Amino acid sequence: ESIEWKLTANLRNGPTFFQPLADSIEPLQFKLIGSDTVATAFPVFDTKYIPDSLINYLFKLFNLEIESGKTYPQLHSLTKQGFMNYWFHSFAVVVLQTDEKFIQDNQDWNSVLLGTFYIKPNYAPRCSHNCNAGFLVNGAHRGQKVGYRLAQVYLNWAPLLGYKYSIFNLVFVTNQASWKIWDKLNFQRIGLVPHAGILNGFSEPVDAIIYGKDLTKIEPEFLSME
Amino acid sequence: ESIEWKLTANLRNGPTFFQPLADSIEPLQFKLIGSDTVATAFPVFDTKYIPDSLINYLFKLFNLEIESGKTYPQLHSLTKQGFMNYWFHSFAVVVLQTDEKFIQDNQDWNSVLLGTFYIKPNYAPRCSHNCNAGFLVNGAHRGQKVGYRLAQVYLNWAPLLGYKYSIFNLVFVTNQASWKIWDKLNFQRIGLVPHAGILNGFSEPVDAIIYGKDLTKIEPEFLSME
Numbered sequence A, B: 001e002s003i004e005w006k007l008t009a010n011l012r013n014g015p016t017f018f019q020p021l022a023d024s025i026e027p028l029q030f031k032l033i034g035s036d037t038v039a040t041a042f043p044v045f046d047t048k049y050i051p052d053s054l055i056n057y058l059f060k061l062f063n064l065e066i067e068s069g070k071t072y073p074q075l076h077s078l079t080k081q082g083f084m085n086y087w088f089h090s091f092a093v094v095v096l097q098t099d100e101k102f103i104q105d106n107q108d109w110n111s112v113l114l115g116t117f118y119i120k121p122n123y124a125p126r127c128s129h130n131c132n133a134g135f136l137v138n139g140a141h142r143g144q145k146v147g148y149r150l151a152q153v154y155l156n157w158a159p160l161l162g163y164k165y166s167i168f169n170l171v172f173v174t175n176q177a178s179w180k181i182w183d184k185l186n187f188q189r190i191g192l193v194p195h196a197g198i199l200n201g202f203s204e205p206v207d208a209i210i211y212g213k214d215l216t217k218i219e220p221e222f223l224s225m226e
Helices: A052-068 A080-087 A146-161 A177-185 B052-068 B080-087 B146-161 B177-185
Strands: A028-031 A038-044 A091-096 A113-121 A130-137 A165-172 A188-197 A206-214 B028-031 B038-044 B091-096 B113-121 B130-137 B165-172 B188-197 B206-214
Touching: A028 A146, A038 A146, A052 A080, A052 A113, A052 A130, A091 A146, A113 A146, A130 A146, A146 A177, A165 A177, A165 A188, A165 B188, A177 A206, A188 B165, A188 B206, A206 B188, B028 B146, B038 B146, B052 B080, B052 B113, B052 B130, B091 B146, B113 B146, B130 B146, B146 B177, B165 B177, B165 B188, B177 B206
Parallel strands: A130 A165, B130 B165
Antiparallel strands: A028 A038, A038 A091, A091 A113, A113 A130, A165 A206, A188 A206, A188 B188, B028 B038, B038 B091, B091 B113, B113 B130, B165 B206, B188 B206
16 A cells, blocks of 8 residues: 655645654554543545545535634635645644544544644744644544644654644633643743733633744653553 | 825825824835935825836836845745735835935935835734835945934824734844834834745745834934934
8 A cells, every 4th residue: 555645754834944753654543541442543635635524524624613703713714725734734634533544535523523734834934943732623523632632743743744842822811722722731831922812702802822842852651541 | 286195195005993193104204324315205105196107117126135045935026016015015114315204206226215115904803903015125225224213203293094013924043124214113022933945045945024103102312303
């Protein structure tokens, strides 16, 4: 079987000054926290390697979060092609509730898709060793600590692409991920933007945290998924 | 004479949720610090309103700073059209050594152009009331505190476009503007990115400061240019 879908040689729009630390990204399998439910995280170097129907589901999933207006700075929904260009500009990950090590076509994404996230350079080339990431969790799987697992996969994989440091620009203080996930994994609150965001359902502007984490010195307890 | 070149109604790609606080931006005249040399800052809402030969000079001026590799995260020089699209995406300012209140054609930009800067939203629409700016000072006018004057013009004008807060994402710690300008005008060091940038002539990666400033509550001593 071809392994092109897994090869870091196929990274697009990655860091300029640093090469990948592995030649491939192998699917990573773990259990949802406190359960026997198996999940598998899959690398996505190019949209052609995942089923179109999964992209359709993710495009809708992101637009739902944009339309709610509490978590991203985007105001308007994207088109399906806009989503593809945006989520998959560089690298991405999809996490499925499955024990398979490949992605099967036409699954019931509504229950099978746990979450997804992108990884791309946060800045232009001289600072491109700093990666940004954005996360989405299927609402049908809320309360199962999917977000925390996505972040562990992120810690495992981002440095393999050659990134040395992680920056999130806008984690709103009202986003529970800040304290449920980022703080617990020892991401530093490296900054705070006061009144950063005009959010749906909040009459006052909402502060945002700037999170940083050194990707070359990760605590092993956070990388282990057992 | 037409005042279209000065009208805030002609702002492009500005803040989504807040309107301009003035209907026009009038040229601002002051002296270079400690001298009798007159300077005038002019708004630029669209490149068509300034002479092409000035755009050519600025395109080269930015590429010189990119090529030196110490101040911007860009690695590669832009084309003239790339520069126009980038510097003038939204609003910009040019500061000339002149007492005239319009921009004349074919001047000796090498001595006449003091500096320039852009102002645009730093983020997507829900956070678009936070503006970013980038500054360039003509090397032939180093040591005359041009940079500090550009920042005072910035403080005077950015809130007129509707911005409420200012963010600079990457002011490298080796950039003397941090302490000569930003600190002195009470921009807060709201964050620090360690090892942020791979800079020409520095063998170690270089830290960058994230600067923030509330544009609705500016000290009047910093706004006065007398």
